[PDB]
Design a binder for this molecule. Structure first.
Ligand code: PUO
Ligand code: GDP
Ligand code: MG
Length: 168
């Protein structure tokens, strides 16, 4: 059957996890998406000439351990670590999420990409150097995105797919 990639999008409330995922699948920018709705989404893509089906968990709600999140964390192949460039706390929260994923994987070498979202906004509080430093510390790529303009959205997901290929 068609190759699949199981992806997980994680990050603080409000950073744009749903908006990024909706842009990828639908090519529309959502100004409001219910923060409680945790679901998976599927998209057929072609990346470096390979047709595949992405299976993407948009994490949401507060109720952490849940049938769905548990199975995607245990079986997920790659993770997008999303913060917003106007949300310093969301950047500070990234290390927590990376630590929890590493503990589920019992591994230091999990495919991940750091995503700094909301690049269209004036109110930057996390500088690109802070992002780049963090990603280099972790050994992973950094991609700047805007779900509003769509800048970097494909690049983020495709880079994650390329990172999974490099690992397996
Ligand atoms: C605004 C609502 C929303 O989008 N979310 C609420 C905050 N969530 C934070 C968050 C926390 C953890 C944890 C822990 C301990 C994890 C997680 C879990 O649950 C299990 C294994 C690995 C990790 Cl990283 C999150 F994925 C996560 O991101 C979701 C965010 C959703
Ligand atoms: N300006 C701008 N707003 C965004 C961007 N991404 C998300 N938003 C907005 O930020 C809010 C939170 O987005 P959402 O996708 O619900 O975040 P989630 O809680 O991580 O799923 C919503 O009002 C979105 O429209 C972006 O790149 N730029
Ligand atoms: Mg959401």
């Amino acid at each position: 059957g068609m190759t699949e990639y199981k992806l997980v999008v994680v990050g603080a409330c409000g950073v744009g996890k749903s908006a990024l995922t909706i842009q990828l699948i639908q090519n529309h920018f959502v100004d409001e998406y219910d923060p409680t709705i945790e679901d998976s989404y599927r998209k057929q893509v072609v990346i470096d000439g390979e047709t595949s089906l992405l299976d993407i968990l948009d994490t949401a709600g507060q109720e952490e351990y849940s049938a769905m999140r548990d199975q995607y964390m245990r079986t997920g192949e790659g993770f997008l670590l999303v913060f917003a460039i106007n949300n310093t706390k969301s950047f500070e929260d990234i290390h927590h999420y990376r630590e929890q994923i590493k503990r589920v994987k019992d591994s230091e070498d999990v495919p991940m990409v750091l995503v700094g979202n909301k690049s269209d906004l004036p109110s930057r509080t996390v500088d690109t150097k802070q992002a780049q430093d963090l990603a280099r510390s972790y050994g992973i790529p950094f991609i700047e995105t805007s779900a509003k303009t769509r800048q970097r959205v494909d690049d983020a997901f495709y880079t994650l797919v390329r990172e999974i290929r490099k690992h397996k």
